[PDB]
Amino acid sequence: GSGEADMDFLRNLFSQKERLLDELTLEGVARYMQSERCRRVICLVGAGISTSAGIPDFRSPSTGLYDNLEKYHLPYPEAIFEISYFKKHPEPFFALAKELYPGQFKPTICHYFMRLLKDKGLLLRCYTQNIDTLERIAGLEQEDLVEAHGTFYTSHCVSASCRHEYPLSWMKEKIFSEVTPKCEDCQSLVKPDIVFFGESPPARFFSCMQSDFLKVDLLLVMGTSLQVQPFASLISKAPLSTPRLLINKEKAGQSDPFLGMIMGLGGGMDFDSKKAYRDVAWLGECDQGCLALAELLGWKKELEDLVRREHASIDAQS
Ligand SMILES: [Zn+2]
Q: 182: annotated binding-site residue?
């Protein structure tokens, strides 16, 4: 390949060992988090943090969700999230969005735990797979978040020459009234800032992925398998001394041999080999693990009060 020199040029430009936990347990993590050294925490979260809110298993065809979409005849399943298809045929996506827009679910204990991390100046960043808006509803702000698949909170005209922004109430009204949103300036489609196939993600995603893991003191991985992009790559970016806690129902089994080898060679999770020194798995429901961890930090009541207050505020304002 005559391209190898160019690939070497870029790789050289973009190229980037203590035991800090006294014990590989939740209790050890909680003590570490109270130590001076634990200043910057990154959470990586997936669908398991929202199950307890009632968010459905979207893999199942058996719930409300997709029946309404038969009439559209998609040419392949991903077409509903592909930008060139959306531009010609926006209706299927907007029919799905009607189900997915927030309003019907509240954040979980796990979300509010991340709100406490923010309140306490510990949260460097939350990387989320989810598109349920629950992190934002819990009070994490855009600067706190890298939403891997984007967000329904913000919306923009799709034309690169315009890119007018529209607020959630403007969109939600249109979607609920089954009016396809058009830009008032240029008449192009307006879509929520969900990152479609074929679309560029916000630049800040890469910049955060390239910076944040250089000086992170603790990774909290909740409600996701380790073998999911981009998370597989991001945990292996942390400093070798940085402790990493997984809170999830189950540890995933092996999913592929390249990804598996890569993990093992690259500084993937090691909870229980003879070389284990910094990774902890806590297996159970995300809410239960965050309750437990909060109790260890002396935050039980603060967290309880926060959940109750915020849930009541959602009731009051619905
Ligand atoms: Zn426009």
A: no
Q: Which CATH number goes with the domain that contains 236?
A: 3.40.50.1220
Cite the DSSP H helix spans in 192-276. 203-211, 231-235, 257-265
3-state DSSP call for residue 312? helix
Amino acid letter for position 12? N
- In this structure, the answer to whether residues 101 and 192 fall within a common structural domain is yes
Gap from CA of 149 to ligand 1 centroid (Å): 22
Tell the residue number behind the tokens 């020199």, with chain if given. Answer: 5
For residue 102, report the distance from its CA to the centre of ligand 1, in Å.
24
224 is known to lie in a ligand binding site: yes
Is 111 labeled as catalytic in the residue annotation?
no
Q: How far apart are CA 223 and CA 248, in angstroms?
A: 5
Domain boundary among 202, 224, 241: 202
Where b means 16+ CB within 10 Å and e means fewer, 197-235 reads eebeeeeebeebbeebbeebbbbbbbbbbbbbeebbebb
Distance 154 CA to ligand 1 centre (A): 14
- Say which of 73, 89, 111, 149 is annotated catalytic: 149
264 a known binding residue? no
Measuring CA to CA, which residue among 66, 72, 53 is closest to residue 98?
Answer: 66
Count other C-beta atoms under 10 Å from residue 19's C-beta: 11
Method by which the model was determined: X-ray
Give the C-alpha separation, 29 to 35, whole Å: 10
| 221 and 259 housed in the same domain | yes
Tokens of 159: 């034309």
Resolution (A): 1.6
Q: Which of 248, 241, 234, 250 is nearest to 277 (CA)?
A: 241
